[PDB]
Paper text:
Since AlFx captures the [name] complex in a stable post-hydrolyzed state during [name]’s ATP hydrolysis cycle, we chose to employ the nucleotide analog ATP/AlFx to attain high-resolution structures. We incubated the [name]: [name] in a 1:4 molar ratio with ATP/AlFx, which generates a stably closed [name] conformation and subjected it to cryoEM analysis (Fig. 4a(i)). The consensus map of closed [name] reached 2.95 Å resolution with significant additional density inside the chamber. Subsequently, focused classification on the inner [name] chambers identified subpopulations of [name] in either one (14.0%) or both chambers (9.5%). The [name] subpopulation with [name] in both chambers was used to further refine the final map of the [name] protein fully encapsulated inside the closed [name] chamber at 3.24 Å resolution (Fig. 4a(ii, iii)). Overall, side chain details for [name] were clearly revealed on the map allowing us to build an atomic model. For [name], we could build a refined model spanning residues 27–214 (Fig. 4b(i), Supplementary Fig. 5e). Remarkably, [name] also interacts with the closed [name] chamber through domain-specific contacts with specific CCT elements, albeit these are distinct from those observed in the open state. Negatively charged residues in the NTD form multiple salt bridges with positively charged residues exposed by [name] and [name] in the closed chamber, these contacts constrain the NTD to bind this region of the [name] inner wall (Fig. 4c(i), Supplementary Movie 2). The strong electrostatic binding between the negatively charged NTD of [name] and the positive [name] hemisphere together with the interaction between TXD of [name] and the [name] lid segments on the other hemisphere establishes a diagonal binding topology of [name] inside the closed [name] chamber. The transition from open to closed [name] triggers a ~ 50 Å movement of the negatively charged NTD H3 of [name] from binding the apical domains of [name] and [name] to binding the positive inner wall of the closed [name] at [name] and [name] intermediate domains. In addition, TXD rotates ~180 degrees and moves ~30 Å upon lid closure, from equatorial contacts to [name]-[name] in the open state to contacting the opposite hemisphere at the apical [name]/2/4 closed lid segments. Finally, the [name] CTD, which is also tightly anchored to the [name]/6 interface in open [name], is released in the folding chamber upon [name] closure, with weak contact with the [name]/4 inner wall.
Numbering used by the authors:
A (entry chain B): 9 to 526
B (entry chain E): 51 to 394
C (entry chain D): 21 to 538
D (entry chain L): 21 to 539
The structure:
């Protein structure tokens, strides 16, 4: 007898894990074609309204854009998005590793092994692998030149799997420089990425100051030397007295004429109070109406209308001023400083160029490609590189990439498995196989002999050479210490832990109950 | 599902939201069924959850077994009422024997071992048994801190479990303070202060207005100038009255405007706005202050004490949160959970 | 022996993208050169357009393939960067994608083709730079040659003798030809009105308004004193709630008299400054002009122009040198715009047009008015004028001038084939294909003119092989001749931007291996 | 700590099969014993039957589940082998499958359950065989008691005084009780006609025909000389294509005269042998009777009967003693059956019958004619008489007799549970489940009789534990008492075959672990 609903169903057997495994493997196979320096990106086309088209390489936006149906696919997409939020890298890596973990899981359950046995084996294996990765982590930060070289290597390895690889030598350092302007503040919003079409992608440059996409007023000057910027968050509009319930109730036209004259005079006195600070520039958050603009033009200052919260925050960071709202006491927290406020033209548009800024705490990156999709992909991948660089500035521990860290931690898992009895050992062996399946995939997407390369790496790591990985520009087994394929320790640790946790949570379901759709 | 070796159940709702859970009450909660007995069993699990919170699957399985044995018995031509009477008699006998069988565990803050062991037993069969040791300890400590032992009552509204994605399950901790998904207004002001006298406040930093409808007639330029002066001095007096109580930090429930934010900045007095009502109450209970509804009655003895307030960034995203730790004696605590998934 | 590469979907997707790009290129192939005839596009609503610009043709035509959309974005990016060549860039991209399809069929990895195309582009940019000759301003002859060349492939070609000199005069009368490094097209206001013929297009150093004079008593003003107004000439009303209460019978007389006196006061202050024509900004929430106010203005023998857009205030101020007023107390003749003449002209029953001409203050702005029988020719004429202006902007941007008529790309094909012959490896074929895929432009120019494409291209290759550079197709002679003596030249920036943008977008297209519907 | 057995599909299939078998069992569970009432089946077409036979109930009720089809086939197989107990067998199979679903819930492999069930079967066969007593034929009392016990649970129970003695007479008048070892039921021809009441059923040692006499001038013949005919009494016609050509006016008269002379010669050859009544076989392709032939036969004062089916000629020859005749020259009095009387009997205006009585060579064949108000009661009476005949057949097959009224299965349940208490292991639970799974028959005997089932079964177990065997449920007394004193017995073959077939069917069902829907 059926009891649920019309449209509600239950899969309480091998069918449930069949659906979960096939969905996770579909996610893994879709994401798999975008790993390594030789990975190839994808086109996302919307069948709905506006037919949005986006060319992308990373797995986070690929998985979040598509509409997944299988709940396991939803689990993988959520894990990828969470991992992108946490660090900003390895979303494709974590999704692929989870997919291979589930594949080895179904292979094991074919051999009639209880899922909790696999769970215990995986817990022990991930503990050992995390311990080995932590033991193999190299650290810097005390050094200055060595840490800068490490940052350059991290940017290179993060940016080599994307389109900017075509000009990687130009871009990596640029990204590093941007992070070097943050001065340790974990504020990625201090970085502005302005994307304008036209010209090769090698024309992109990190500005030596700031760029604002706003407009000068009518009568204000359009160039200043030795700027004294005051940044404000005042009204400058009609500017109601804010006492709700106030109205003019008079008996003549002279009275209302006098009241409007008083309103204009109070606005004039507010502008005079602003000018008393000793300024030649003024940046406001919301609109500036016609009378304050006229007064500013007459006085001889420069005013900016409608610079949003992000704009004023970035100007405050790059110039050093405070966000003013009340100008009663000009002697309190002071202004900012620059050296030129020239208007500079890019493409066909004009932007305000703050040069000679007092502080480098914020900056702008100009992205200029030949196609809007190229601009979007460059922006997303540059965001990933900046995220990783900021994360490794916060925590300078690094581990070698190219599969070397994966190979060594898989070797540790294998060594632990060899000394553990029972059916746990095969679970840990499957864990190690799934973990080693990543460099296999990188070589496959590259197009080399994956089996030979992986066997060579296994032999080299078992011997003791703990810095061996895939040299992809030639396709052999090289030394990541000499070559310089580094990676953030935080990124790899988060990838491992998140993938293992998602595999564990998915594997222990034996019943899927779907309610009737709305 | 019941038992440490049990397996989870993954349910999607009518919108497409996935929950991978093991709690029998919740599992039966999203199980949409039409048959009346299934509805009764769902209500059974929910009631057992509400009264106790443990053994939700156990009562469902026990009821199913009891009904199966009842069916086998009434197959032999016995009245259902006799089966029910026998079930009640045996339940009485089992309750008496289970009263006889038991022992006691001492519940004091001085020794927290048996409490931790019982919490560990409960935490088994759930995925969080990955850690299985520190979460039991934090749960025990939270209950012992919040509970009012004299009344033998635990108020669950003093425990604020909050989950944020990212990190690991190792980060699930017990803040003996309060955490709020807000941030200091006016980002120029400091992101942290040391031991702070807090001014818990409700009315907004805006010029007052009576609830009754009103019309303030302005009839001359002198009256207009007087209104301007009234606004300016209202802001200035409000800020100076906040300052004169010695508070290093203020908290307002209803938010405020720019002409107040700059005054709070320029007087070196950080504050936050748009804090929810229950969050205000939890802050008041934790930091030990008193909620005041008007600036005119903000004294020195109505402030609270905070060990430290911190603004925390939470990874690459820009979701900043405010945490208040190290109160003199916090009767309300917070349980903070982190992980690599929403469902986890 | 080798990787099996079981997956065949990437190959199918790549060939589909190449086929779509080739089809899109062939669609507009017949719309290139002087002999190419324009396309006709009618969208879903019954609106039609007669377009020869590739960007417009591709935008109006709602394509559905991702490669086609990337191509239309490429075309619009090339228009933004240069303004001419938006057809040739698409043709080049599609043609060399069709060239690389057989490279894919020959067993070559897409990455090798992309890198080899990058190297070929690197060589080609140097080839184009060497082929060029320096160009310097104040040489009106070469500027007229470039403008005529830009306008030859448009419907307005027969008017180019009366339309290119004014096209270059517009640019020369806006920017200083000494230290410019860029020009702006925003301050070149193209105003279009239906009626007349093309030979009636005009260039005015003053200001053109489509607004209408409110007081139909005054039409012409000699020695005009123009003054912008940003406030309102109506009954006074404060920003906050306004109310007047009447309790006696004399109060109605008092309020009427006081309102009349207030309006008369405002008009008297306006008139006493010598202002003889008034410009009222388009104001909402308060009547900009009152009937009594307009009556008083007419009584004091003034001309009033009302309903002026907010975004046009900057243009008007830059043209006639006036400064806006938002308060009557600041309305003075010391900051009042002046002009020699203000006229309102009826356009033979087709419209009413306002001219402010002879502005005594300097004006860094000109205005072009375009005339035509029907609307389609007017749209195409303004687009062609915009193309000529963009060509002059390219000349100003970087000072480098090359020949046209097929000569640059055919010389590039020869040089790049010779360069590919010394590049033994798997990239030799790719550089050769890139070199031989840039002969599509001379072939298209030959076949669109009715010439014999095979013999024309072969004779062009022979002529350029002997070093007879700057030799190309001539449609007046109907053969191949030196182009410089025929006065057909184009700025180098157009060709370089086209080549670079096409190569970058083709590399991006080659990086694609899958398409999935979201 | 063992195989995971990930696939739960086989367990679900087994539970579904067990549930379907239990549903089929307890659907007809209310049709057991002398107090269980019969069902009414109305099939898709406009046909209705009122039946208590388990085999017919299960056949007419077109089931869908494969296990239900297995159970209906089991019931028909038990009907074939035994003829009675076709309800108890399906009840037993469903009941012990219901018992074994709990075993499947206890983590016991199906093969172990099947082997333990087979061992319990092997023990139960011995228990039942030892419990019985030898029986000797030609003992009217035991035969009558067995027939009455078979008929009691049927609609004709109130007629058991008139149906049991004739039911045993039918069997005893076919075989020789000296050396039979079996009985062929084909020679017990059952003829049904509407009308009358059940009390007018009759047994005849002669022959009964549903045909009608061609000539309505003679109906009663005394000292009749019956003779079968397999040739056609019409104008001669050869097997190959036949044609008569006429070219004269005298040819027509001549051909008519030859036809008449040939027919008259055939009829005279028939008559000169002393034949008194004629039985003409039904011959398609050639009218076995012509108007001229029937005219001549009636003129010679004879009785003629036609349209006799080819399948009944063996029965007629075995009954009255005639021998088939396919040629006129072979028609003589040496191969001509004789009878004391031939009659055309009218059943009070509800049809007509032919009765041949007093055959001088009484063969091993009798006939039963049944009377009834409506068709349904007639069909049910036929089924009940057939069940009684099958019971006597089983008693003839193997000579062994057991008590009834729940005594055999309850005694087997005891002896088998103390047998299980000596086989400690994994199979002890399975054997105990088998032992306690056959308490269903006594429980339902108590339930359908209105007695309290739990107390009745408890008293039954207690009284067979005290050595007072042959104790069971009595519905006349309304309690529990000795069964042989109540004159309720059944042959050992019935119960032993029921148990064996049920156990085999369950052991076969328990080996299923998947179902596939073929195209
Ligand atoms: N230039 C390289 N050489 C060798 N291995 C690399 C290189 N670049 C990336 N990898 C490896 O490829 C894996 C995935 O890289 P990537 O595709 O950049 O991940 P994501 O898409 O998350 O940025 C990383 O674990 C890294 O170790
Ligand atoms: N008079 C001419 N003689 C020969 N070739 C010409 C002439 N005018 C233009 N061309 C060629 O036609 C090509 C296409 O130019 P045109 O259609 O004006 O703009 P676009 O380059 O955007 O298609 C140019 O490459 C140019 O070399
Ligand atoms: N007079 C009676 N008293 C008690 N039990 C009886 C009596 N007659 C029959 N039974 C029991 O009823 C059971 C079923 O017999 P019956 O219903 O005639 O055949 P079937 O089982 O084929 O339907 C037999 O096992 C027999 O023991
Ligand atoms: Mg990366
Ligand atoms: Mg529990
Ligand atoms: Mg052109
Ligand atoms: Mg019977």
């Amino acid at each position: 007898v059926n009891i649920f609903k019309a449209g509600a169903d239950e899969e309480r057997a091998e069918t449930a894990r069949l659906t979960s495994f096939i969905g996770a493997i579909a996610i893994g196979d879709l994401v798999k074609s975008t790993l390594g320096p030789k990975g190839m990106d994808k086109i996302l086309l919307s069948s709905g309204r506006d037919a949005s088209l986006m060319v992308t390489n990373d797995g986070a936006t690929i998985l979040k854009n598509i509409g997944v149906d299988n709940p396991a696919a939803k689990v993988l997409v959520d894990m990828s998005r969470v991992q992108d939020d946490e660090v900003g890298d390895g979303t494709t890596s974590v999704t692929v590793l989870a997919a291979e973990l589930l594949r080895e899981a179904e292979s094991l359950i074919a051999k009639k092994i209880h899922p909790q046995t696999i769970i215990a084996g995986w817990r022990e294996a991930t503990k050992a692998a995390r311990e080995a990765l932590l033991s193999s982590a190299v650290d810097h930060g005390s050094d200055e030149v060595k840490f800068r070289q490490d940052l350059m290597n991290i940017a290179g390895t993060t940016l080599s799997s994307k389109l900017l690889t075509h000009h990687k030598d130009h871009f990596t350092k640029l990204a590093v420089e941007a992070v070097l302007r943050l001065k340790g503040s974990g504020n990625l919003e201090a970085i502005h990425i302005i994307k304008k079409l036209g010209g090769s992608l090698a024309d992109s440059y990190l500005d030596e100051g700031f760029l604002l996409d706003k407009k000068i007023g009518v009568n204000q000057p359009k160039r200043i030397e030795n700027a004294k910027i005051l940044i404000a968050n005042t009204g400058m509009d009609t500017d109601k007295i804010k006492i709700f319930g106030s109205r003019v109730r008079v008996d003549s036209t002279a009275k209302v004429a006098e009241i409007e004259h008083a309103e204009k005079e109070k606005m004039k006195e507010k502008v005079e109070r602003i000018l008393k600070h000793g300024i030649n520039c003024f940046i406001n958050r919301q609109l500036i109406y016609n009378y304050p603009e006229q007064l500013f033009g007459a006085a001889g200052v420069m005013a900016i209308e409608h610079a949003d919260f992000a704009g004023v925050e970035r100007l405050a960071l790059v110039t050093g001023g405070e966000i003013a709202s009340t100008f009663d006491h000009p002697e309190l927290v002071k202004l900012g400083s620059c050296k030129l406020i020239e208007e500079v033209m890019i493409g066909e548009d004009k932007l305000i160029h703050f040069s000679g800024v007092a502080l480098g705490e914020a900056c702008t990156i100009v992205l200029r490609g030949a196609t809007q999709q190229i601009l979007d992909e460059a922006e997303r991948s540059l965001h990933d590189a900046l995220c990783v660089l900021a994360q490794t500035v916060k925590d300078s521990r690094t581990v070698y990439g190219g599969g070397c860290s994966e190979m060594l931690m898989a070797h540790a898992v294998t060594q632990l498995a060899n000394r553990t009895p029972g059916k746990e050992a095969v679970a840990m062996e499957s864990y190690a196989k799934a973990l080693r399946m990543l460099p296999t995939i990188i070589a496959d997407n590259a197009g080399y002999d994956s089996a030979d390369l992986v066997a060579q790496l296994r032999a080299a790591h078992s011997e003791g050479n703990t810095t061996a990985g895939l040299d992809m520009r030639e396709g052999t087994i090289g030394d990541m210490a000499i070559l310089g394929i580094t990676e953030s320790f935080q990124v790899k640790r988060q990838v491992l832990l998140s993938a293992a946790e998602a595999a564990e949570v998915i594997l222990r379901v034996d019943n899927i109950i779907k309610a009737a759709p709305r | 599902s019941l038992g440490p070796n049990g397996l989870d159940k993954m349910m999607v709702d009518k919108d497409g939201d996935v929950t991978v859970t093991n709690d029998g009450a919740t599992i039966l909660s999203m199980m949409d069924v039409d048959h009346q007995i299934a509805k009764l069993m769902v209500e059974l699990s929910k009631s057992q959850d509400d009264e106790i919170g443990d053994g939700t699957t156990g009562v469902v399985v026990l009821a199913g077994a009891l009904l199966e044995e009842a069916e086998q018995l009434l197959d032999r031509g016995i009245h259902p009422i006799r089966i029910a009477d026998g079930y009640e008699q045996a339940a009485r006998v089992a309750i008496e024997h289970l009263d006889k069988i038991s022992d006691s565990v001492l519940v004091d803050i001085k020794d927290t071992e048996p409490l931790i062991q019982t919490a560990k037993t409960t935490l088994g069969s759930k995925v969080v048994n990955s850690c299985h040791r520190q979460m039991a300890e934090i749960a025990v400590n939270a209950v012992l801190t919040v509970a009012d032992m004299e009344r033998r009552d635990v108020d669950f509204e003093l425990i604020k479990v909050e989950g944020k994605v990212g990190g690991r399950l190792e980060d699930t901790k017990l803040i003996k303070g309060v955490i709020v998904d807000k941030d200091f207004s006016h980002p120029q002001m400091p992101k942290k202060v040391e031991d702070a006298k807090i001014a818990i406040l409700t009315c907004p930093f805006e010029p007052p207005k009576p609830k009754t409808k009103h019309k303030l007639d302005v009839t001359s330029v002198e009256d207009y100038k007087a209104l301007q002066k009234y606004e300016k001095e209202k802001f200035e007096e409000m800020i100076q009255q906040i300052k004169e109580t010695g508070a290093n930090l203020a908290i307002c429930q209803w938010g405020f405007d720019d002409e107040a934010n700059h005054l709070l900045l320029q007087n070196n007095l950080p504050a936050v706005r748009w804090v929810g009502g229950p969050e205000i109450e939890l802050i008041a209970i934790a930091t030990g202050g008193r909620i005041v509804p008007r600036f005119s009655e903000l004294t020195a003895e109505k402030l609270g004490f905070a060990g430290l307030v911190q603004e925390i960034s939470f990874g690459t995203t820009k979701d900043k949160m405010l945490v208040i730790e190290q109160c003199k004696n916090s009767r309300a605590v917070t349980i903070f959970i982190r992980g690599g998934n929403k469902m986890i | 022996k080798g990787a099996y590469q079981d997956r065949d979907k990437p190959a199918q997707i790549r060939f589909s993208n190449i086929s779509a790009a080739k089809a899109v290129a062939d669609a507009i192939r017949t719309s290139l050169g002087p002999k190419g005839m324009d396309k006709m596009i009618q969208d879903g609503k019954g609106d039609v357009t007669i377009t020869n610009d590739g960007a417009t043709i591709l935008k109006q035509m709602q394509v559905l393939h991702p490669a086609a959309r990337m191509l239309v974005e490429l075309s619009k990016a090339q228009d933004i960067e240069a303004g001419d060549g938006t057809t040739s860039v698409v043709i080049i991209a599609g043609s060399l994608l069709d060239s690389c399809t057989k490279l894919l069929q020959k067993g070559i990895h897409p990455t090798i083709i992309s890198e080899s195309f990058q190297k070929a582009l690197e060589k080609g940019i140097e080839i184009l730079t060497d082929m060029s000759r320096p160009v310097e301003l104040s040489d009106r002859e070469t500027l007229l040659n470039s403008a005529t060349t830009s306008l030859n492939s448009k419907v307005v070609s027969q008017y180019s003798s009366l339309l290119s000199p004014m096209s270059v005069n517009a640019v020369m009368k806006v920017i200083d030809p000494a230290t410019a490094t860029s020009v702006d097209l925003r301050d070149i206001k193209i105003v279009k009105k239906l009626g007349g013929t093309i030979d009636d297009c005009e260039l005015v150093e003053g200001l053109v308004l489509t607004q209408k004079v409110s007081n139909s008593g005054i039409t012409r003003v000699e020695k005009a004193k123009i003054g912008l107004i940003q406030f309102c000439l109506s009954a006074p009303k404060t920003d906050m709630d306004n109310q007047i209460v009447v309790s006696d019978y004399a109060q109605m007389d008092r309020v009427l008299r006081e309102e009349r006196a207030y309006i008369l006061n405002l008009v008297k202050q306006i008139k006493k400054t010598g202002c003889n024509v008034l410009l009222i900004q388009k104001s909402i929430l308060r009547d900009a002009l009152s009937d009594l106010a307009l009556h008083f203005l007419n009584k004091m023998k003034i001309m009033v122009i009302k309903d002026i857009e907010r975004e046009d205030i900057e243009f008007i101020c830059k043209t006639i040198g006036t400064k806006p007023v938002a308060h009557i107390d600041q309305f003075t003749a010391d900051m009042l715009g002046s002009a020699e003449l203000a006229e309102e002209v009826n356009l033979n029953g087709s419209g009413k047009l306002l001219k402010i001409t002879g502005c005594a203050s300097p004006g860094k702005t000109v205005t072009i008015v375009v005339r035509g029988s029907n609307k389609l020719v007017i749209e195409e004429a303004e687009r062609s004028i915009h193309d000529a202006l963009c060509v002059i902007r390219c000349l100003v941007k970087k000072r480098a001038l090359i020949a046209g008529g097929g000569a640059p790309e055919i010389e590039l094909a020869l040089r790049l084939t010779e360069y590919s012959r010394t590049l033994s490896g798997m990239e030799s074929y790719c550089v050769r294909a890139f070199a031989d895929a840039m002969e599509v432009i001379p072939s298209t120019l030959a076949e669109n003119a009715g010439l014999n494409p095979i013999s024309t291209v072969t004779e062009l290759r022979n002529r350029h092989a002997q070093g007879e550079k700057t030799a190309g197709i001539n449609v007046r002679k109907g053969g191949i001749s030196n182009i410089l003596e025929e006065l057909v030249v184009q700025p180098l920036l157009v060709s370089v931007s086209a080549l670079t943008l096409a190569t970058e977008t083709v590399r991006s297209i080659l990086k694609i291996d899958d398409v999935v519907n979201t």
